[PDB]
Amino acid sequence: LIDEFNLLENVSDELYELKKLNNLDEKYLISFEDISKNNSTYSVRFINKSNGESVYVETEKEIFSKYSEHITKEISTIKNSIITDVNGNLLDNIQLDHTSQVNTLNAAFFIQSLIDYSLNDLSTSVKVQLYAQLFSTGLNTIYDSIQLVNLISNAVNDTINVLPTITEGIPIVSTILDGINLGAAIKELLDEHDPLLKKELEAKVGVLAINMSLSIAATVASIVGIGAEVTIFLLPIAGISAGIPSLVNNELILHDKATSVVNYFNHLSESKKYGPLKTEDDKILVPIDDLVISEIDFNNNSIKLGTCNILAMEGGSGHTVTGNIDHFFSSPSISSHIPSLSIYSAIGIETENLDFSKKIMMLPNAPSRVFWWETGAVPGLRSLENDGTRLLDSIRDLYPGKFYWRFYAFFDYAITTLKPVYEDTNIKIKLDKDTRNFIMPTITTNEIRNKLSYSFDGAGGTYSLLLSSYPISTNINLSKDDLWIFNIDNEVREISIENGTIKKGKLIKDVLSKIDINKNKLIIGNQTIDFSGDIDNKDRYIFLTCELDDKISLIIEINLVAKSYSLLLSGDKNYLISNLSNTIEKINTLGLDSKNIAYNYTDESNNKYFGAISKTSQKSIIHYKKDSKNILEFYNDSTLEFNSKDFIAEDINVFMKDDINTITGKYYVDNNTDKSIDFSISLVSKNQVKVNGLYLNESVYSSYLDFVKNSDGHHNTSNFMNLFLDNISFWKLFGFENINFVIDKYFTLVGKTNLGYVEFICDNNKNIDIYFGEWKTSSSKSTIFSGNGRNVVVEPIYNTSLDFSYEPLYGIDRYINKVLIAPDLYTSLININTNYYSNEYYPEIIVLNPNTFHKKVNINLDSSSFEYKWSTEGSDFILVRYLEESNKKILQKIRIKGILSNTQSFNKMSIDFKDIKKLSLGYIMSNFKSFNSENELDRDHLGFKIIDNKTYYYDEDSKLVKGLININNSLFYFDPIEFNLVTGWQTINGKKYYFDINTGAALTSYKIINGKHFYFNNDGVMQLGVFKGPDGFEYFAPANTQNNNIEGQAIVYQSKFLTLNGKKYYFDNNSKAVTGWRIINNEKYYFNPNNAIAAVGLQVIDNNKYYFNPDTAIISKGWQTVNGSRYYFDTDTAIAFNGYKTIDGKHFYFDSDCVVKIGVFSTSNGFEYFAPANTYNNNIEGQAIVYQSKFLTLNGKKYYFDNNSKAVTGLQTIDSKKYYFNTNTAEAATGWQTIDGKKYYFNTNTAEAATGWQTIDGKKYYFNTNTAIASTGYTIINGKHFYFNTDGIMQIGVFKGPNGFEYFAPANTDANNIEGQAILYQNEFLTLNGKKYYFGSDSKAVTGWRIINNKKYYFNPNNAIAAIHLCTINNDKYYFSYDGILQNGYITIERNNFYFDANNESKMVTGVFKGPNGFEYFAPANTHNNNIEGQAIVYQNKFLTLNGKKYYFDNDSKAVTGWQTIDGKKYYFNLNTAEAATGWQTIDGKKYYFNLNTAEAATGWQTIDGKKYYFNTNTFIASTGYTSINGKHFYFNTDGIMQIGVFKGPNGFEYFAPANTDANNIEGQAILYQNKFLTLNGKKYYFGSDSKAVTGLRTIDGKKYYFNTNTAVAVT
């Protein structure tokens, strides 16, 4: 030890110089593990303690690398003695191998000394090195700057025990499981509840401690309570009342037609009536669907609304308002560039002083929004009155001239389309200290959902949140003491939306596979919760919960900061156990990996149940109280293994390591409140319990030591420990007096003295010895480790002398090796107290010579000099006090080591005795008597040694083993006073063993001892009673029983009965007990082949159940009653009847346990009533009795019996009432049955079929008074007509009878009509919840086309129902107003414009027509970009020829009307139909002519089929009469036809001639024609010099003529 004391100062000196030489501060730490050598130069790492940065310094001196392999070799030894740390708690790995024990002690004792200083710089480097190794991956591998600074901080600023011990002083019961020292750790977790401890104990070593804290109890209760409330609701998804946007053309459209839009506003006006929150189910407040709530303030009892606006209007002219119908001249137009209009400001939504008394609330589902809209031409709407139209009006009126939703310009328009544009909404929820339950909405259009955001402000209460299947970003600001519950039922179950309502379904595989847990972010499946606020609170637990069953709830327990989660199940105890197999598999399906589950449940009657379940093997421990008794139930997988109905322990704790259970507590021995033993117990089998530790308080250990000291040398093997448990009556802890208490390796007993405590432990040999012990007197500290022999070492404690006494050694003296007294420099007194004569062994005392000597050294013995005798052994002085005058012989040996080696130290010694003082070693040698210590068997040999023809065994520490001990799985005995191997017969405290006369081993099983027969168990103890050998079962009996036998020898017993204190045996002729079946005195007996005892009570010998009389042990036959159940055993063969059977004229039934049945059961013989006793005649119990033509009510079901006492099945009439008995059970039916199409109802308390009119819990039915059958279809009930649907429900509406549709009207609608009875309704409308009918003369509803008050309608001839909106009836589309009234013209449908020609019964048609924006080409389908049928299409700058007409269309795709010239041609288009004009046309006075094919205005000369006209090139008018063109003159008819002949112009009659008449003239040109006759058309003319025709009387070439002065024609 001084060898290292020099080495340390050697290596810290050089370390000191190496530091100054590279100018290294006291803040730099050498790092011995990483030193490299490369070609004669060592490179040595130094870590800067402050910032964790590294520096490497070169050296030549090899002391550092040399001393590093010294010390790292010893730290490894220590690191292998420790399993891990759980939150800084180091968990020891207990080693029972003696060389492991002795190696880790030396390493521990070494390193623990270097740490323990105040030079310190080399010391704190060793401590840091060790720390970085036990708690981390080794200093040599850490290179993170921060991680190192924190490691090194922890290493210096705390303190680590690394010396072997188990309790380490703590006065508790130690649990060593799988070789790990868990006991101390689990106490702290249960004491102060560290989140970090709890997590690492579960993760690193598999430990689940369970917490019966009444707080946690309450919490789990309130969580499961919340889950039982919130999950039961059938709520709808978001928007089934407001609407769900459609995505047409990449923008979203909430509503698309006028009526729908008006109705959405109608919906919103419910905020007026019901405030922001309707209370559906009297249990939960629900926000008005799509109402934008942007803050909910629970302190203020107030709401904040978000923004919900609609676009503005601007402009317009001539606003008149007549009959609340806005009329215009210039219609306004919507603008997105003017401020938009708040819809809610028109609504008086009261948003303050709200009744937040209900605890469950659905969150808002509406982000803010600005509504874009559109106007359209829709007819009929002028008579519309809703709370919808009333709201829209209010918006109009709140914001005059900026919003008009239904007006008139030159056609009546209206709001047509509602396009929302959503903006991110953040909804703050400001909580109170109260308790609040929140349900997230299921929002289906993604575009809406990703604008919503929840933000909670915690305030100390309990808050739940029901996650939806489709996530919404939520954020929780944590307060200090608030409790957050997340029920994840929808996130962890397959979801389904059936008619838009949310039903939960299957459990979804592997959802909880990954749970990302982070200081401020949890990820459960698809949902992400973000946390802010008090997010470093190490103590908070957040809870995840869900419902696995009707009655079983799962709670996932999450610590955000310790990034860890744990499992826990709550529910009825007896239920969970019955379904433990099944509800575990649900956990695995979730993909939860946790290997242990805690049980924590509180019933309706307020009794707490606690427990823990191993997932992997389904072993469970349950603890609870009942009538103040302590209950413990251990279940193996739903079947009950161990059950203690009164556990007599205080301070109970329960925990699980992997699948091992441990229960610890205090037990008061003999119920003395002053005698507390502390226990650690693992339940294993029904009648077997494992003890893995006992801590004895001061009183019990002293009683225990007494028991050890009177062990008779039976103080060593594990079975010795069983005999202690016996002596202290420990079975009383449980109640069962024969429990197998299992004492096995790693068992610890640790008792407490008034000076310290000793720790004992079990070997790999199943032997018990001192492991560690320590006690302190006022002045001197006595220590003992199994790893250094089992020597007691006496050292001084500070706060000058060394006291020693034999008294602390009382009882444990057996196990002690030697007492080594070890003085230091500063001890000049060693007091030795020899006058103590109560022990059985007095270990040699060795005074260890201080190697460094001391100024003086003085021993003080309190005995008299004459009792002593000195001796010399080498350089050792010896004193021996021999007390022989008593009856026991005490021999106290004292040896001063090596004091003969130093002639100086030898004369320093003074011993002083009781009667003589200040004596010297010299004096004692010169005057005391001497002796010669020749201890041949105080050798140093390990094993079986053999000395002076006697055999000794030497144990692990090379001591001499004494007593009854296990060696090499064999049992031996060494004399308690002489220690040699004993052979042959030994008594050990009442109980006789026997050890082989050749090998020493105690006898096992059955052997022959010098002519006798002897039976020793596996512990070797001699047994009394009956036991089996290779000749049979003998009776190894007490002494003096049959011819003065010695104990346990098989004796003679033949053909006689033996009853060994409560049993029965029979011995045959050959004196060997009898087994099998055996007939004795003509009477049957069964003796078990395993132990030769007579069976008593019910028994099963080879799948055959017999009853043996409990007193006489003989068979019993016939009827019998055992434990209040009747049985039948065969009168011949005694086998017990099971199944159907017959017995001397009676039917009987017995279920699988051969117990009589009672009731109605089906056999191959019928359905028979196996009846109770004294029911009919004095019938036997269970006898099928005659029950003739009667009804049987079996306190339960109902049966009818026919004449041969058998139950009836099927449909059966009995005494005018109909019944329906089950085919398989024979029992009456109840409720709805359908017996071959026919549907019945059987009254649940009498089973009779219902007859007549009936109200069955919600609706009305009629059951035919003769056949009990439900009514279906049109149906007559005593002359009055009624209607009933497919399931027979009476309907109230309009339905098809054989005489048309009839108003099956409610009660009191015409002259006290009965509800549901058809009535008279003559010449009137009927508007019945949306559907609208008209009833004609006969008060039968009219179908088909029909006009009333000059408004045509159309009632669907399949339901009598008026038509609304666009409709297809007989291949033609019509448009009906909101009230069924047919309309015509320009109607806008879904943002397109169509035409419904009023000249075609208003059929929608394709053509060119006038809409209030122009003439538009209502094209057929697929004419421009896959357009719709009859939709106005774009058609720009093109002509169009259609069905033999011709139009032309301008830039704005609208026809053109009137006089038009289009790219070099003139056209005229009908002011009334935009049709091209074709053919002869008198237009606005002038007469024109347009081409028949191309409708072009004709210009110039044209021949219109038979006649030539000339149309003026300037004005396109057909010219008439004397018309000069191109100089030349022509003459045309009144109707524009060219003429050829003589005609009058301004200058007179000219000749308008054929072509080439004169001077190559063109046809019809007036020509020169001089002094010539011209005779055409029979008429004769003369032309003069002026080429003009002549009138009057004239004289032409001799002849006279008279020419008509009117026509210039010759009339002569």
Author numbering: 857 to 974, 980 to 1660, 1669 to 2481
Any passages from the paper?
Two homologous exotoxins, toxin A (TcdA) and B (TcdB), are the key virulence factors of C. difficile, leading to C. difficile infections (CDI) with variable clinical features including life-threatening pseudomembranous colitis. Most of these toxins are composed of four structural modules: an N-terminal glucosyltransferase domain (GTD), followed by a cysteine protease domain (CPD), a delivery and receptor-binding domain (DRBD), and a large C-terminal combined repetitive oligopeptides domain (CROPs). Triggered by acidification in the endosomes, the hydrophobic pore-forming region of the toxin undergoes membrane insertion and facilitates the translocation of the GTD and the CPD into the cytosol. The GTD then glucosylates and inactivates the Rho and/or Ras families of small guanosine triphosphatases (GTPases) in host cells, resulting in depolymerization of the actin cytoskeleton, cell rounding, and ultimately cell death.
Here, we report a 3.18-Å resolution crystal structure of a TcdA fragment composed of DRBD and CROPs I–V (residues L843-T2481, referred to as DRBD-5CROPs), which serves as the foundation for us to piece together all the known fragment structures of TcdA into a complete structure of TcdA holotoxin. The crystal structure of DRBD-5CROPs was solved by molecular replacement (see the Materials and Methods section), and a near complete structure including residues 855–2,481 was built except for a small flexible region including residues 1,661–1,667 that had no visible electron density. The CROPs I to IV then forms an arch-like structure pointing to the distal tip of the DRBD, where the first and second SRs and LR4 of CROPs IV interact with the DRBD. We found that a well-defined β-hairpin in the SGS of DRBD-5CROPs (residues 937–953) directly interacts with PFR-α1 and α2.
